[PDB]
Scaffold this active site. Structure first.
Site, mmCIF file in Angstrom:
data_model
loop_
_atom_site.group_PDB
_atom_site.id
_atom_site.type_symbol
_atom_site.label_atom_id
_atom_site.label_comp_id
_atom_site.label_asym_id
_atom_site.label_seq_id
_atom_site.Cartn_x
_atom_site.Cartn_y
_atom_site.Cartn_z
ATOM 1 N N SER A 44 40.344 83.651 -52.468
ATOM 2 C CA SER A 44 40.019 82.477 -53.107
ATOM 3 C C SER A 44 41.269 81.416 -51.744
ATOM 4 O O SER A 44 40.054 79.860 -52.240
ATOM 5 C CB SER A 44 39.931 81.759 -54.697
ATOM 6 O OG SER A 44 39.150 83.272 -54.670
ATOM 7 N N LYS A 47 40.138 78.512 -50.368
ATOM 8 C CA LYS A 47 39.386 76.571 -50.998
ATOM 9 C C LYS A 47 40.370 76.043 -50.688
ATOM 10 O O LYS A 47 39.867 75.064 -51.127
ATOM 11 C CB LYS A 47 39.387 77.479 -52.511
ATOM 12 C CG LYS A 47 37.557 78.320 -52.659
ATOM 13 C CD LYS A 47 37.137 78.638 -53.750
ATOM 14 C CE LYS A 47 37.013 79.871 -54.760
ATOM 15 N NZ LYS A 47 36.431 81.632 -53.878
ATOM 16 N N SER A 104 38.291 78.732 -59.095
ATOM 17 C CA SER A 104 37.846 79.799 -57.925
ATOM 18 C C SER A 104 36.099 80.117 -57.967
ATOM 19 O O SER A 104 35.763 80.291 -58.170
ATOM 20 C CB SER A 104 38.433 81.175 -58.505
ATOM 21 O OG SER A 104 38.416 81.398 -57.164
ATOM 22 N N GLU A 140 30.826 82.572 -49.269
ATOM 23 C CA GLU A 140 31.156 83.192 -50.822
ATOM 24 C C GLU A 140 30.004 84.314 -50.851
ATOM 25 O O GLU A 140 28.372 83.728 -51.270
ATOM 26 C CB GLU A 140 31.098 82.689 -51.792
ATOM 27 C CG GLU A 140 32.333 81.365 -51.901
ATOM 28 C CD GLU A 140 33.806 82.640 -52.535
ATOM 29 O OE1 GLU A 140 33.553 83.887 -52.619
ATOM 30 O OE2 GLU A 140 34.985 82.576 -51.589
ATOM 31 N N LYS A 208 46.781 78.435 -55.707
ATOM 32 C CA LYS A 208 46.002 78.453 -55.948
ATOM 33 C C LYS A 208 45.970 79.977 -55.438
ATOM 34 O O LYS A 208 45.828 80.672 -54.654
ATOM 35 C CB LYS A 208 45.003 78.024 -54.350
ATOM 36 C CG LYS A 208 43.040 78.585 -54.010
ATOM 37 C CD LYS A 208 42.622 78.103 -55.761
ATOM 38 C CE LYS A 208 41.095 78.839 -56.089
ATOM 39 N NZ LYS A 208 41.251 80.371 -56.555
ATOM 40 N N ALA A 211 41.767 87.500 -55.146
ATOM 41 C CA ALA A 211 42.155 88.660 -55.269
ATOM 42 C C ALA A 211 40.437 88.761 -54.615
ATOM 43 O O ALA A 211 39.052 88.211 -55.029
ATOM 44 C CB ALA A 211 42.143 89.178 -56.994
HETATM 45 C C1 LIG Z 1 39.261 84.511 -55.040
HETATM 46 O O1 LIG Z 1 39.945 84.841 -54.055
HETATM 47 C C2 LIG Z 1 38.123 85.150 -55.768
HETATM 48 C C3 LIG Z 1 37.924 84.703 -57.237
HETATM 49 N N1 LIG Z 1 39.689 83.848 -57.413
HETATM 50 C C4 LIG Z 1 40.363 84.501 -58.099
HETATM 51 C C5 LIG Z 1 41.542 84.041 -58.497
HETATM 52 O O2 LIG Z 1 42.359 83.880 -59.458
HETATM 53 O O3 LIG Z 1 41.937 82.953 -57.461
HETATM 54 C C6 LIG Z 1 39.639 84.764 -58.941
HETATM 55 S S1 LIG Z 1 40.678 86.855 -60.257
HETATM 56 C C7 LIG Z 1 40.324 86.323 -61.822
HETATM 57 C C8 LIG Z 1 41.444 86.753 -62.777
HETATM 58 N N2 LIG Z 1 41.131 88.184 -62.185
HETATM 59 C C9 LIG Z 1 40.000 88.037 -63.147
HETATM 60 C C10 LIG Z 1 39.350 88.248 -64.637
HETATM 61 O O4 LIG Z 1 39.972 88.607 -65.127
HETATM 62 N N3 LIG Z 1 39.331 87.306 -65.406
HETATM 63 C C11 LIG Z 1 37.745 87.567 -65.534
HETATM 64 C C12 LIG Z 1 39.509 86.574 -66.035
HETATM 65 C C13 LIG Z 1 39.538 86.656 -62.781
HETATM 66 C C14 LIG Z 1 38.216 85.784 -58.847
HETATM 67 C C15 LIG Z 1 38.517 87.103 -58.452
HETATM 68 C C16 LIG Z 1 36.476 84.821 -55.377
HETATM 69 C C17 LIG Z 1 36.422 84.686 -53.865
HETATM 70 O O5 LIG Z 1 35.206 85.614 -56.047
#
Ligand SMILES: *C(=O)[C@@H]([C@@H]1NC(C(=O)O)=C(S[C@@H]2CN[C@@H](C(=O)N(C)C)C2)[C@@H]1C)[C@@H](C)O
Length: 262
Positions: A44, A47, A104, A140, A208, A211
């Site tokens: 992400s 972005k 994100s 995406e 930013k 993951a």
């Molecule tokens: C981006 O990299 C992916 C997207 N971005 C992020 C981010 O923190 O930048 C999230 S990760 C977040 C913590 N882990 C997940 C969970 O714990 N939640 C339900 C709270 C969400 C997400 C992975 C994108 C490309 O898909």
């Protein structure tokens, strides 16, 4: 001080993955580098360059940020925390940018990409600001494969640090746009466990996170240590197993290591 180098090296070895760090201290332009020229999948974090490309347009196109786009049940991707709330209605580009940056939101990201004409346009923007390493190739969620050795949707910690600096502190963007990007980065709601976790609680941060596959866990940020000159930090981390768990704690440790005493 190679103390930091030894600590980073130990952090990486103990993590069992590949760590990428690039710290720029705007006080004297000194840098802390660890695999800073190697490529890492951005996840992400791409972005930021994307949202910045839209902000760039707003410099010449008046009110473009208020332009509307419709959100259809077909636009939804694997992560739509904000956009899913607008299925059937509209969101301005500002709202979309805010959604991709602060939550994100993937659907919002693809909406911005569609507006810009594709990932190739974001790459062009990067080149226009002097970033010759950055490259956006897919939308995406495909851009999150993070396959070892694949150069698609990757950049270097140093290249991203320099670009983030140019965008938030430099002249890559005009005053108003620069202020909006900084405001958006400070309003990020997903960085609590990353770089921020390794900093004194009262320091102001814009960042930013990201993951994706191969346990890739990233974060890029601008740090204001009290009343001292801003720190630009990029912490990229990836692992051997495609299904590896994310290591936000690794970025926090890295952040503490390089910013301690700044
Ligand atoms: C981006 O990299 C992916 C997207 N971005 C992020 C981010 O923190 O930048 C999230 S990760 C977040 C913590 N882990 C997940 C969970 O714990 N939640 C339900 C709270 C969400 C997400 C992975 C994108 C490309 O898909």
């Amino acid at each position: 001080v190679q103390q930091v180098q030894k600590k980073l090296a130990a952090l990486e070895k103990q993590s069992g993955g590949r760590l990428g760090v690039a710290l720029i201290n705007t006080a004297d332009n000194s840098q802390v580098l660890y695999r800073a020229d190697e490529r890492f999948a951005m996840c992400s974090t791409s972005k930021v360059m994307t949202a910045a490309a839209v902000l760039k347009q707003s410099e010449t196109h008046d009110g473009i940020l208020q332009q509307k786009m419709t959100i259809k049940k077909a636009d939804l991707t694997n992560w739509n925390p904000v956009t899913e709330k607008y299925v059937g209605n509209t969101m301005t580009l500002a709202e979309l940018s805010a959604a991709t940056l602060q939550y994100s939101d993937n659907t919002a990201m693809n909406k911005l990409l569609a507006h810009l004409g594709g990932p190739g346009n974001v790459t062009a923007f990067a080149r226009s600001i002097g970033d010759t390493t950055f490259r956006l190739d897919r939308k995406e969620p495909e851009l999150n494969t993070a396959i070892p050795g694949d150069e698609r949707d990757t950049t270097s910690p140093l290249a991203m640090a320099k670009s983030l600096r140019k965008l938030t502190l430099g002249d890559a963007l005009a005053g108003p746009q620069r202020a909006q990007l900084v405001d958006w980065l400070k309003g990020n709601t997903t960085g609590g466990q990353s770089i921020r976790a390794g900093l004194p609680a009262h320091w102001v941060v814009g960042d930013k996170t990201g993951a994706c596959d191969y346990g890739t866990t990233n974060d890029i940020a601008v740090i204001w240590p009290e009343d001292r000159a801003p720190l630009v930090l990029v912490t990229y981390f990836t692992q051997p197993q495609q299904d590896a768990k994310w290591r936000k704690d690794v970025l926090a440790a890295a952040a503490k290591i390089v910013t301690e005493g700044k």
